[PDB]
Amino acid sequence: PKSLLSLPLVGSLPFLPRHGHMHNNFFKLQKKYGPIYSVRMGTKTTVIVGHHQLAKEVLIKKGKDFSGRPQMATLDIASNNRKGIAFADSGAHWQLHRRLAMATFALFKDGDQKLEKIICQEISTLCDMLATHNGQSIDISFPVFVAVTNVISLICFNTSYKNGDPELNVIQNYNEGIIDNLSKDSLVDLVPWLKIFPNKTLEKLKSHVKIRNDLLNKILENYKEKFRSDSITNMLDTLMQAKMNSDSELLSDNHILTTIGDIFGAGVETTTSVVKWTLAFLLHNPQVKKKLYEEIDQNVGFSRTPTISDRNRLLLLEATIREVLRLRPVAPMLIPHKANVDSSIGEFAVDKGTEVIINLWALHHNEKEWHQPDQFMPERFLNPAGTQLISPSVSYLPFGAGPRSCIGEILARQELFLIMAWLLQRFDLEVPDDGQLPSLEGIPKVVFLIDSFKVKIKVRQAWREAQ
Amino acid sequence: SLLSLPLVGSLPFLPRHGHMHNNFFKLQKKYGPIYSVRMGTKTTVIVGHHQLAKEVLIKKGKDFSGRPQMATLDIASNNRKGIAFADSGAHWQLHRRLAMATFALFKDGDQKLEKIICQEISTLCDMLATHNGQSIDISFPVFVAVTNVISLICFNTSYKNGDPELNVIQNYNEGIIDNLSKDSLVDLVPWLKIFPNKTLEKLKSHVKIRNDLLNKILENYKEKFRSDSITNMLDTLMQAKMNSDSELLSDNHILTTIGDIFGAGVETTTSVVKWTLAFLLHNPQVKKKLYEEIDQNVGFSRTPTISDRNRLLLLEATIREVLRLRPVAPMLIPHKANVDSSIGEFAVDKGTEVIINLWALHHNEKEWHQPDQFMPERFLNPAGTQLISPSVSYLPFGAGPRSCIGEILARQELFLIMAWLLQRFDLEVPDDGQLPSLEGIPKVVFLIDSFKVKIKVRQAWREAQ
Ligand code: HEM
Numbered sequence: 001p002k003s004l005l006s007l008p009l010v011g012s013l014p015f016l017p018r019h020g021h022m023h024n025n026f027f028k029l030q031k032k033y034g035p036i037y038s039v040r041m042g043t044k045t046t047v048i049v050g051h052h053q054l055a056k057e058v059l060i061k062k063g064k065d066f067s068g069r070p071q072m073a074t075l076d077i078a079s080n081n082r083k084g085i086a087f088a089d090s091g092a093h094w095q096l097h098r099r100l101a102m103a104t105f106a107l108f109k110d111g112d113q114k115l116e117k118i119i120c121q122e123i124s125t126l127c128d129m130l131a132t133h134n135g136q137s138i139d140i141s142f143p144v145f146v147a148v149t150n151v152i153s154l155i156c157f158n159t160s161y162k163n164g165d166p167e168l169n170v171i172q173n174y175n176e177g178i179i180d181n182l183s184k185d186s187l188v189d190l191v192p193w194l195k196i197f198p199n200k201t202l203e204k205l206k207s208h209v210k211i212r213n214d215l216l217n218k219i220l221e222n223y224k225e226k227f228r229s230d231s232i233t234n235m236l237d238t239l240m241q242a243k244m245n246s247d248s249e250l251l252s253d254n255h256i257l258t259t260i261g262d263i264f265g266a267g268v269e270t271t272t273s274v275v276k277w278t279l280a281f282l283l284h285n286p287q288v289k290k291k292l293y294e295e296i297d298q299n300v301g302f303s304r305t306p307t308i309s310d311r312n313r314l315l316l317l318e319a320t321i322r323e324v325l326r327l328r329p330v331a332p333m334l335i336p337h338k339a340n341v342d343s344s345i346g347e348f349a350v351d352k353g354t355e356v357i358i359n360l361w362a363l364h365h366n367e368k369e370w371h372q373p374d375q376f377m378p379e380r381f382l383n384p385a386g387t388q389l390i391s392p393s394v395s396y397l398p399f400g401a402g403p404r405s406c407i408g409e410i411l412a413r414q415e416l417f418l419i420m421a422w423l424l425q426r427f428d429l430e431v432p433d434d435g436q437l438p439s440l441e442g443i444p445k446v447v448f449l450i451d452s453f454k455v456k457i458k459v460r461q462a463w464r465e466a467q
Numbered sequence: 468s469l470l471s472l473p474l475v476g477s478l479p480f481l482p483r484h485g486h487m488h489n490n491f492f493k494l495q496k497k498y499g500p501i502y503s504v505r506m507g508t509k510t511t512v513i514v515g516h517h518q519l520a521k522e523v524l525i526k527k528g529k530d531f532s533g534r535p536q537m538a539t540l541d542i543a544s545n546n547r548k549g550i551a552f553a554d555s556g557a558h559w560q561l562h563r564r565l566a567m568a569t570f571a572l573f574k575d576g577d578q579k580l581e582k583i584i585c586q587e588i589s590t591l592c593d594m595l596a597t598h599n600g601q602s603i604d605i606s607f608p609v610f611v612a613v614t615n616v617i618s619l620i621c622f623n624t625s626y627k628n629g630d631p632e633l634n635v636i637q638n639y640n641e642g643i644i645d646n647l648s649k650d651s652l653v654d655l656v657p658w659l660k661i662f663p664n665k666t667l668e669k670l671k672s673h674v675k676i677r678n679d680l681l682n683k684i685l686e687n688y689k690e691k692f693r694s695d696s697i698t699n700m701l702d703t704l705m706q707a708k709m710n711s712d713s714e715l716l717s718d719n720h721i722l723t724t725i726g727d728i729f730g731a732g733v734e735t736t737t738s739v740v741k742w743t744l745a746f747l748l749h750n751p752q753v754k755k756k757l758y759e760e761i762d763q764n765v766g767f768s769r770t771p772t773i774s775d776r777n778r779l780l781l782l783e784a785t786i787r788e789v790l791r792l793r794p795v796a797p798m799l800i801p802h803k804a805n806v807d808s809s810i811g812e813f814a815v816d817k818g819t820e821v822i823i824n825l826w827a828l829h830h831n832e833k834e835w836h837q838p839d840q841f842m843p844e845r846f847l848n849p850a851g852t853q854l855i856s857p858s859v860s861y862l863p864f865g866a867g868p869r870s871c872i873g874e875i876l877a878r879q880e881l882f883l884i885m886a887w888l889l890q891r892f893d894l895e896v897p898d899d900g901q902l903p904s905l906e907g908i909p910k911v912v913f914l915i916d917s918f919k920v921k922i923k924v925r926q927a928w929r930e931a932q
């Protein structure tokens with residue numbers, strides 16, 4: 001029986017570009033194809049991994065095999081040709097700067113530079129500014145941005161900004177610009193639209209990165225006179241020292257600049273996003289918010305301000321931060337990895353140079369590893385009696401794992417806990433007067449961001465009477 | 468057999484569709500330049516020709532110098548205190564007089580208005596220059612500059628960079644403007660009283676923050692005031708009360724007058740600057756001529772001064788054309804008949820609200836050539852060597868008893884901001900090509916949608932520094 005012919009197929013993708021969130025689109029495909037599959041774009045083959053078993057083989061068991069980074073035209077501009085840490089390929093450059101960066105956080109282990117003290121100082125500044133807005137609905141994005149930017153500038157240069165220093169608006173402006181132009185889908189851009197049609201994405205990215213580089217360069221030069229081999233106390237000292245003791249090819253001035261830029265961008269954008277997400281979920285869940293005010297008042301009161309040691313007491317607050325980092329991870333697909341050598345994932349072959357994506361969203365929403373994964377439930381991280389924190393699932397990796405794992409996790413966890421505890425001790429946070437709630441859908445950029453929203457700020461009466 | 472339906476109400480256009488001032492203007496084709504509308508028991512008269520407008524504001528200004536009472540205006544003005552929304556009477560008359568007498572304290576000296584103004588503009592230009600090569604919204608830096616100028620006129624104080632109080636003011640200013648009215652204070656249908664809403668409660672909560680902030684300043688000034696140092700607006704008001712009428716100089720009355728001056732000085736000037744920048748982004752040809760004008764007449768050996776209004780004629784005509792096309796108050800503030808009177812020989816009863824449609828006057832096709840078009844040249848002789856007044860149908864600052872009292876301040880603020888900015892900065896379209904929408908948002912002030920501008924330090928200024 002004759003039959004019409006099937007049309008020649010020159011290309012095929014399993015979902016529509018720019019429709020839906022990529023991480024969720026990859027996760028939905030796991031019903032059809034399993035937890036690991038590949039897609040080819042020209043000559044580049046990419047592998048997506050969506051189960052914690054296989055993710056741990058990529059990140060840990062074989063971490064060094066898959067520690068590379070793929071080269072992207074956008075990340076080249078941002079990383080000054082793959083310098084820095086996050087977007088540098090595995091190699092001597094990345095191995096050294098990563099280690100020196102991790103070593104700087106020991107300069108702030110304890111003493112007067114104890115991170116908790118640096119953080120609580122800026123948090124005090126932030127809470128004071130916020131209190132002037134008593135009774136008003138405001139967007140707290142910038143006040144937080146300034147606080148974390150000062151904590152990071154103290155770690156990097158032992159310098160901090162003064163209220164109103166226009167530099168803070170200049171950085172805000174080129175951070176905004178680069179994040180808006182770098183990627184529209186969690187750094188996983190299947191189709192290379194940038195190279196098919198005429199656009200100015202790369203030209204915009206250069207403009208913003210020029211202002212960033214020139215600003216950092218001005219600081220790094222004015223610091224060449226301040227430096228003393230006897231006084232290493234910040235990240236810039238650590239780097240400048242190794243350059244003197246040298247290799248010196250690796251610690252060039254552009255290499256140092258770009259490595260500082262990564263720490264700054266990483267430390268400000270991630271932390272500020274997660275605070276905003278946490279506020280948003282509490283506006284949608286006043287029942288959790290009420291319980292957090294009760295916990296913070298019974299365990300800390302108002303005689304003092306929260307300290308890191310309160311982490312052992314404010315368990316629901318720690319469970320909320322954990323639940324927010326599960327639901328809305330800062331990087332729902334981490335940063336793309338790359339196979340440094342021929343290797344394998346779950347017995348499947350993977351050739352050298354293959355881009356490997358870990359779908360963190362899939363891991364955090366596996367219906368077999370989590371009860372009601374779509375729901376904001378801080379209790380999932382506490383025992384039934386709410387007296388002890390737990391780890392309900394092994395499919396939980398907000399900070400990654402292995403050689404490319406996060407180096408600022410300690411800082412981030414202290415900033416988050418303290419910001420939230422200080423804010424909750426002093427302020428009622430309510431829906432703005434016109435009743436709008438933030439959309440919890442999110443915008444998947446290099447960072448998984450939430451749409452800007454306003455919050456009604458009111459100084460709590462319990463905290464007022466206590467004065 | 469078939470009859471017409473009983474008709475219980477009729478309005479000549481659809482509420483909340485289009486801009487009111489323009490809907491009123493369109494109706495003149497059909498009804499003439501003056502007609503009336505009756506809402507319940509309140510009759511309102513709309514006036515749309517310069518001849519009749521000048522009879523209401525000037526020839527009969529005293530007959531029509533009242534203000535209609537509105538629930539929303541009552542909250543903003545603490546029950547019709549202040550000046551702008553105060554009914555004609557002793558209170559309004561005295562405070563307006565004292566507010567105007569305050570500007571003579573700044574006619575010359577170390578505190579000459581041009582010195583106060585140029586100081587702030589210098590700070591603004593230094594802040595804006597840090598943004599070299601970036602696209603920004605210049606709303607807040609201007610708001611802060613002008614808030615400092617007015618604060619210096621009222622208290623001889625200014626805010627330092629970063630003072631969170633400026634964000635607090637910006638917040639409740641935005642809140643009050645957003646909830647005061649949706650259409651130039653000419654809200655025909657009283658929706659606020661028909662359906663459940665929280666408009667008046669949002670306004671109260673914003674005004675409370677304003678009143679509390681102002682009260683703190685005023686009661687901390689009682690410990691500063693001296694009879695021998697009268698140098699600002701608060702001094703002028705306190706002296707009058709010391710020399711006393713004193714019943715009209717209550718603390719609330721002084722607060723509300725100061726509130727009116729701060730709000731009027733800051734939100735009007737900030738809007739006009741944003742409107743001027745928008746039009747030049749749409750008219751690069753005018754923008755180039757301005758750069759050429761200022762370069763040849765002021766150069767880069769010094770910053771512009773007020774005396775430069777004699778040479779920067781295109782800049783002065785551009786400002787005039789922006790106040791014609793996008794008046795801060797397209798329908799002024801509503802007036803009211805204090806007595807039984809007449810307009811154009813028609814009877815107007817006492818208590819009748821009377822609205823002057825300035826938009827109609829400024830777009831009259833018989834009085835202006837291509838009134839829809841942005842044409843700074845219309846205010847210069849064909850040779851571009853002297854400013855002219857091409858029509859009598861031009862009243863951006865009102866006229867008569869309720870006319871603007873800050874015109875002089877505003878005209879110097881506007882001229883100097885633009886001159887300094889054009890001397891030093893290239894102002895161009897942001898990187899993604901978006902241009903501002905010139906349609907506007909008719910609120911208590913005729914506002915322009917928020918937009919951004921790429922700011923760059925000019926090479927001429929650079930080289931010459
Ligand atoms: C809640 C906050 C944060 C979360 C959830 C987070 C998560 C992550 C993730 C998902 C990655 C990619 C992991 C991978 O490729 O396997 C990463 C890497 C990185 N993180 Fe963060 N991060 C946070 C905060 C911070 C802070 C405060 C800093 C700096 C002080 C920082 C510095 C970095 C850097 C420099 C990298 C690049 C590391 C590399 O490629 O070797 N992060 N982090």
Ligand code: HEM
Nearest residue numbers: 550551731732735795796799800864865869871872873877
């Ligand atoms: C471009 C800037 C400005 C424009 C176009 C403008 C225009 C106007 C207009 C049209 C009126 C209403 C006239 C009427 O109701 O018949 C008015 C009134 C008023 N203006 Fe302005 N004005 C400006 C700036 C200022 C400034 C800088 C101040 C104070 C420093 C100020 C203070 C006032 C006050 C207090 C009134 C109320 C007068 C009264 O009701 O007796 N304005 N202005």
Ligand SMILES: [C-]#[N+][C@H](C)[C@@H]1CC[C@@H]2[C@@H]3CC[C@H]4C[C@@H](OC=O)CC[C@]4(C)[C@H]3CC[C@@]21C
Nearest residue numbers: 086174175178212262265266269270331446
């Ligand atoms: C964790 N995490 C995240 C996975 C990463 C950490 C840092 C890293 C980059 C580093 C560069 C920087 C440039 C800054 O724009 C100018 O400076 C904007 C913000 C970035 C793009 C951040 C965004 C988060 C990241 C991808």
Ligand SMILES: [C-]#[N+][C@H](C)[C@@H]1CC[C@@H]2[C@@H]3CC[C@H]4C[C@@H](OC=O)CC[C@]4(C)[C@H]3CC[C@@]21C
Nearest residue numbers: 551639640643644677727730731734796911
């Ligand atoms: C000319 N003109 C202008 C068109 C008018 C002059 C002043 C007047 C009022 C006075 C009160 C003030 C309260 C401020 O909110 C807190 O302070 C917000 C801004 C206002 C509402 C301004 C708006 C402009 C005006 C109607």
